[PDB]
Amino acid sequence: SYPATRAEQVVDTLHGVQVADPYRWLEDEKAPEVQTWMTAQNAHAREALAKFPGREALAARFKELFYTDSVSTPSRRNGRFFYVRTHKDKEKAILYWRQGESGQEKVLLDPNGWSKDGTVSLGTWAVSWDGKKVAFAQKPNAADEAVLHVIDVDSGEWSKVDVIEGGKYATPKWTPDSKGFYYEWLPTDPSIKVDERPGYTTIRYHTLGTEPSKDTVVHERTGDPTTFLQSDLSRDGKYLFVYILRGWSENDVYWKRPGEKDFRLLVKGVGAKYEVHAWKDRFYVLTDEGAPRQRVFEVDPAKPARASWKEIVPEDSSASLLSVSIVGGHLSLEYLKDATSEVRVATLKGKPVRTVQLPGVGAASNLMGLEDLDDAYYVFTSFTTPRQIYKTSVSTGKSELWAKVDVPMNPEQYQVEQVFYASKDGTKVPMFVVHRKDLKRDGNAPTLLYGYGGFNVNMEANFRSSILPWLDAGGVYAVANLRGGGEYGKAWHDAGRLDKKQNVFDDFHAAAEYLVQQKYTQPKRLAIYGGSNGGLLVGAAMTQRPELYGAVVCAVPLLDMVRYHLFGSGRTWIPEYGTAEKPEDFKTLHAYSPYHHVRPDVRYPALLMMAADHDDRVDPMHARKFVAAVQNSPGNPATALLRIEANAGHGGADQVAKAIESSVDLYSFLFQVLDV
Numbered sequence: 001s002y003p004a005t006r007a008e009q010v011v012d013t014l015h016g017v018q019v020a021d022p023y024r025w026l027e028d029e030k031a032p033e034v035q036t037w038m039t040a041q042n043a044h045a046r047e048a049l050a051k052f053p054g055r056e057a058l059a060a061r062f063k064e065l066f067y068t069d070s071v072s073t074p075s076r077r078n079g080r081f082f083y084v085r086t087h088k089d090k091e092k093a094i095l096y097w098r099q100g101e102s103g104q105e106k107v108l109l110d111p112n113g114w115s116k117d118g119t120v121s122l123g124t125w126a127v128s129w130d131g132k133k134v135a136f137a138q139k140p141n142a143a144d145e146a147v148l149h150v151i152d153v154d155s156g157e158w159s160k161v162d163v164i165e166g167g168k169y170a171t172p173k174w175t176p177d178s179k180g181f182y183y184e185w186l187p188t189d190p191s192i193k194v195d196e197r198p199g200y201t202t203i204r205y206h207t208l209g210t211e212p213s214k215d216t217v218v219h220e221r222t223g224d225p226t227t228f229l230q231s232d233l234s235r236d237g238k239y240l241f242v243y244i245l246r247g248w249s250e251n252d253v254y255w256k257r258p259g260e261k262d263f264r265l266l267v268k269g270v271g272a273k274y275e276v277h278a279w280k281d282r283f284y285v286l287t288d289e290g291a292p293r294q295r296v297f298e299v300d301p302a303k304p305a306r307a308s309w310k311e312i313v314p315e316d317s318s319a320s321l322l323s324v325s326i327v328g329g330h331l332s333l334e335y336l337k338d339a340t341s342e343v344r345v346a347t348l349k350g351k352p353v354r355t356v357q358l359p360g361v362g363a364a365s366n367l368m369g370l371e372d373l374d375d376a377y378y379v380f381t382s383f384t385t386p387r388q389i390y391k392t393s394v395s396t397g398k399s400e401l402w403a404k405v406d407v408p409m410n411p412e413q414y415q416v417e418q419v420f421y422a423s424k425d426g427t428k429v430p431m432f433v434v435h436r437k438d439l440k441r442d443g444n445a446p447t448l449l450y451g452y453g454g455f456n457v458n459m460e461a462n463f464r465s466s467i468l469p470w471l472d473a474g475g476v477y478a479v480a481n482l483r484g485g486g487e488y489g490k491a492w493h494d495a496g497r498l499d500k501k502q503n504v505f506d507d508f509h510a511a512a513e514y515l516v517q518q519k520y521t522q523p524k525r526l527a528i529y530g531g532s533n534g535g536l537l538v539g540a541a542m543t544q545r546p547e548l549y550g551a552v553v554c555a556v557p558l559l560d561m562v563r564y565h566l567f568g569s570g571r572t573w574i575p576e577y578g579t580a581e582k583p584e585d586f587k588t589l590h591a592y593s594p595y596h597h598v599r600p601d602v603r604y605p606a607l608l609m610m611a612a613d614h615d616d617r618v619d620p621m622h623a624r625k626f627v628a629a630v631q632n633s634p635g636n637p638a639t640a641l642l643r644i645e646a647n648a649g650h651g652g653a654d655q656v657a658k659a660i661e662s663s664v665d666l667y668s669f670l671f672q673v674l675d676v
Contacts, residue, residue: 001631001640003040015583019562019596023625027567034624038644041627045608045641052668053676058469062660065465070405073368073377073389080131080153082108091118091655095125095134097153108153109136111654119647121654124171128178133208135162135172135181141614143649144168144569148183150208164212169201173233175258180207182218182231182240195565198572199225203242218242219254219263225571234278235371239301241266241276247575248456248493249273255301266304279326279348279371285309286324293489294321296331296350312350320489322458327369327376328394334366336458338418339430339487343367343378345394354397360385361416363460367392377402381463383434383477384411409468413437416461421514423483424506427495430481431511432461433520436471446475446674447521449511453482453504454533455576456493466663473676476520480511482537497576499588505540512541512548524550525674531555531610532618532650539594539626546604551673553666555610556650559622561593562586567619595622598629606673607640608666612648620644639673 007022026034072084072093079100084093095109114120123137123146132153137146148170150162164170166188172181185204192200203219206212219242222229228245242263244252253274254263267274272289276299283299296313313321319335319342326332330353331346341364343356358364362382369376374395380388386405392398417433439445448470452459459479467477481487484496484504496504512528515521528549530538535557542552562580564570571579578585590596598604607630611623623642630640643665647653652662670676 002044003037005037005628005632007628007632014562014580014590015586017586017590019590021560021563021625023628026624026628027563027621029620038624038642041624041642042644045643048639048641049643049665049668052672054671055664055668058664058667059660061469062466062663064408065468066656066660066663068405068407070387071389071403073379075127076370076373076375077127077129078131080127082127082131082134091657092121095122095136097131108134108151108156114138117647118653118655126172126174126181128174128181129176130178132178133174135174135183137167137170139649141647141649142651142654143614143616145616146170148172148206159208161211162206162208164206164215169228169230171230173231175233176235176237180205182233184230185215195567195571196225198569199223199227201229203229203231226574228572232276236278238281239278239283241278247573249490249497249575264304266299267306275324277324277326282348284312284324284326284331284348286321288490291315292491293319296321296324296333298348298350313346320487320492322486323366325366325368326371327367328374329371330394332367332376332394334364336487339432339458339460339481340418341365341460345397356392356397357399359388359390361461363462367394369394382461383416383432383463383467384414386463386465405463407465409465414471419514419518421510423503423510425503427483427503427507429483429507429510430487431514432459432479432481433515434467434471434477434479435520436474439474439476439520441519443516443519443522444525445521446470446473446525446527446670446676447478447515448475448527448529448670449478449480449508449515450529450534451480451482451504451508451511451537452530452532452534453480453484453496453508453537455484456486458486469667470670473671475676476515478511478515478520480508482507482511484533498578499584501577501588502592504537505544505592508537508541509545509548512545516548523548527551527553527605527670527674529553529555531557533558535559535618535622536561536594540592540597542605542607543594543597543599544592546602549605551606551608551670553608553610553669554623554626556612556615556618556620557609557622557626558618559593559626560595561589562596564619564622567621568615569617570619595626595629598626598633600634602633602636604630604633604636604638604640606638606669608669609640609642610662610666611642611644612650612652613644613646614648615650617650641669 010021010024067088070086074081074083082097086093092111096105098105111122121139121142123139125136146167148164148167150159166186169184174181204215230243232241242254250269253266275286277284285297295315297309298312319337323334333344335342345353365379367376386407389403391402420428535554539559565579580586609623627642
């Protein structure tokens with residue numbers, strides 16, 4: 001609570017309703033008073049954290065766990081392999097290449113050398129089809145803003161001509177001739193307001209070796225900051241696709257043969273999404289149209305009207321179809337069955353071939369490879385199993401372990417449960433519960449409950465070494481598959497967005513109640529964690545039902561839902577949340593907006609706000625205003641800290657040492673406030 005925060009009497013009348021904003025002044029980070037306050041809040045948080053218990057042991061253990069030897073799945077181009085490694089003595093991962101399967105590897109891009117202090121990161125990278133060039137993003141502070149560069153693989157020379165600012169949204173699509181790439185571009189025009197900028201994305205083509213001002217405009221902007229514009233290109237270069245994405249629930253698809261004058265409309269989505277892959281002059285369309293758990297159509301480009309589409313993979317009787325890839329002349333279909341993935345190989349005509357046999361219960365990626373390569377890879381993890389990569393033959397189903405991350409832990413000490421609990425409305429919600437096998441079910445284990453609940457995002461059994469000290473201290477880690485996610489398909493997502501957002505929060509309150517009912521824990525020993533839309537989640541949870549929770553960790557959050565659309569990338573989430581600019585949407589948002597529901601004379605859970613100084617996606621003002629409201633809430637005795645990570649974007653600083661520090665801070669906060 002340490003630094004004082006002046007409260008003002010700012011009020012606005014929105015749709016006939018008075019809305020108070022006492023900490024409005026903290027929105028503008030350009031004001032010196034706000035910078036001074038930020039510094040003082042962070043200093044207070046670091047001072048407080050430094051006194052919390054277990055820190056030397058946590059730091060040593062996280063150092064042993066977070067520095068790893070790992071390798072990514074390889075991108076194969078013209079006999080060369082390209083892949084990222086981590087090393088135990090490096091702060092950032094490095095991009096390598098080699099000639100042939102067992103050629104000697106060489107460093108291609110080492111972001112550890114891009115600055116003296118780790119403040120420039122590698123973003124997206126795309127290898128040319130000839131294996132001679134890599135187009136890649138450099139991202140200051142690992143924030144979203146990106147500049148595209150190109151490196152010559154044989155020489156390691158960075159192009160001085162092929163440098164393109166405004167690459168935030170770009171994923172380069174190289175043409176088969178390796179002479180240039182399609183990409184998503186933003187103009188740098190100082191008269192465009194930050195909140196309107198997302199409506200200016202354009203598709204351009206960059207020819208290597210030419211000035212980017214000469215890049216052709218392939219598709220003009222939508223002019224609508226509630227959309228994304230994205231392109232894709234078939235392997236043969238014959239089909240160019242442009243998507244207009246309206247949030248995470250619907251999209252349009254346009255296409256042409258490059259050189260044609262006009263785009264053709266494939267489909268205009270009305271409450272349905274469509275993703276297309278072209279191979280050998282057929283289009284494979286993955287969609288939720290008339291199929292909440294998705295299905296696949298084959299479309300003939302010569303007869304592309306909807307009536308002529310042929311269903312080749314019908315909607316499954318129970319499983320959610322998440323993605324389709326074309327590998328080795330086959331379809332690879334990634335399904336989710338009660339939040340656990342299954343991968344199925346089918347022919348191009350949709351006939352089942354086989355199910356990929358996984359090593360165990362956990363999370364598997366879809367097969368990754370190329371349409372004309374028989375070798376395809378997948379990644380497998382579990383809550384207790386570090387990443388394993390398998391190399392498989394699409395044609396035969398042979399599978400071999402290709403890589404495994406060695407981590408100094410003993411998986412046999414832990415178990416993972418999957419449970420199903422009823423929400424307020426009776427919905428059965430899945431949850432994973434992870435703990436030592438010898439956990440006493442005495443209602444007193446320190447428990448950390450994680451959720452997100454939105455944007456069609458699924459909570460899966462990812463391996464996180466960060467939870468191991470918690471489990472070893474007798475803690476429970478729980479992950480709820482709240483509505484708003486995609487776990488049970490479109491119906492799951494739709495029941496947790498827009499006017500139904502409150503269902504997500506109700507699902508989370510019910511998870512907290514379940515963990516107590518089932519003798520894992522009690523409120524004073526229960527913490528909740530979420531980030532971004534998950535930050536909104538935990539802010540809503542703590543303002544609605546503070547009595548259920550002992551502590552809250554809230555990362556890079558949205559919390560003023562009446563004003564979120566005015567800052568950063570906010571307008572792009574209007575299709576998910578609505579906008580307070582509209583009366584009906586306002587009523588919904590105002591009812592849950594955590595910043596507007598810090599009631600006085602309430603003992604809140606202890607609060608640790610984990611903010612980032614260079615978050616150019618989710619505006620940092622939300623965490624400032626909310627922490628001020630909690631610190632100054634009459635009769636709140638619980639700690640409320642604002643920790644600001646330096647040189648950090650929305651996903652952190654991309655520096656292992658800083659990740660260690662953040663985890664030490666998080667878990668030492670928990671040990672203190674839950675009395676571990």
